Amino acid sequence: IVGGYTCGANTVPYQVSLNSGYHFCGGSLINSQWVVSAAHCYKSGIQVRLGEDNINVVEGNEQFISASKSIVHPSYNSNTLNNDIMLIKLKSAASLNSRVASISLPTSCASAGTQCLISGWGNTKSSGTSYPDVLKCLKAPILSDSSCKSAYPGQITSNMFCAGYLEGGKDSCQGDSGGPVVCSGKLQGIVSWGSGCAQKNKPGVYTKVCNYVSWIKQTIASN
Numbered sequence: 763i764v765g766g767y768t769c770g771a772n773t774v775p776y777q778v779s780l781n782s783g784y785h786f787c788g789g790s791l792i793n794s795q796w797v798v799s800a801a802h803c804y805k806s807g808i809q810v811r812l813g814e815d816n817i818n819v820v821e822g823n824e825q826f827i828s829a830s831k832s833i834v835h836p837s838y839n840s841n842t843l844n845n846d847i848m849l850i851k852l853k854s855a856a857s858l859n860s861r862v863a864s865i866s867l868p869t870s871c872a873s874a875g876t877q878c879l880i881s882g883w884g885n886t887k888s889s890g891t892s893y894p895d896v897l898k899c900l901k902a903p904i905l906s907d908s909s910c911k912s913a914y915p916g917q918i919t920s921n922m923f924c925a926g927y928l929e930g931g932k933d934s935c936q937g938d939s940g941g942p943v944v945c946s947g948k949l950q951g952i953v954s955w956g957s958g959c960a961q962k963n964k965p966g967v968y969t970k971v972c973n974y975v976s977w978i979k980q981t982i983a984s985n
């Protein structure tokens with residue numbers, strides 16, 4: 763997250779860190795047994811880390827649980843990142859409490875102009891690299907689909923939306939991948955892609971979760 767703020771420990775209790783020896787992606791807890799992340803975060807050997815603030819220090823509220831199954835969306839296209847969503851089932855159910863809590867799925871999409879909360883442990887610099895160890899947060903509005911398509915001609919589908927600031931300075935970034943965009947209490951986005959970070963006229967692109975709620979619910983119920 764570039765241009766954000768330190769969230770505060772466990773103030774985003776649905777935020778998970780996916781660990782394969784190191785943090786490599788965010789995700790969102792949607793019930794005691796299931797995490798949603800980006801399909802471009804897919805790999806084997808995932809451990810889900812809940813209740814994290816400093817990902818390098820055991821602070822006392824963590825739960826570390828291995829994934830039993832990963833399900834990349836059937837229509838994911840790695841060339842374009844269309845349908846960039848994946849479900850991860852935990853080997854054992856998380857113990858839900860005030861620092862480890864699910865986020866509600868949308869019953870409808872969000873509109874342009876809605877303010878959202880984006881969070882993660884990704885890069886905090888727009889030029890260069892600096893990775894924080896505590897969770898960073900950013901308030902950012904959903905941008906119009908027309909401004910999104912003008913920023914990235916040819917590349918935006920109905921399964922994507924832009925959020926952030928066309929002036930630059932405030933954005934998600936590498937390492938935030940797979941993490942949440944929450945608006946009015948609902949998980950509306952997943953950190954997906956973009957050109958650089960916090961550059962002018964290059965906002966972040968996010969998987970449009972509301973298009974996937976039926977698939978999420980039916981997949982969880984059948985697995």
Ligand SMILES: NCc1ccc(CNC(=O)[C@@H]2CCCN2C(=O)[C@H](N)Cc2ccccc2)cc1
Pocket residue numbers: 802840841842843933934935936937938939953954955956957958959960965966967
């Ligand atoms: N500042 C927002 C942001 C937040 C978080 C990220 C992390 N996401 C990526 O790194 C993805 C993974 C595949 C490659 N990516 C990319 O974005 C590529 N630069 C562009 C691309 C390539 C193929 C298909 C679609 C887009 C990036 C930008």
Ligand SMILES: [Ca+2]
Pocket residue numbers: 814815816817818819820821824
């Ligand atoms: Ca920790």
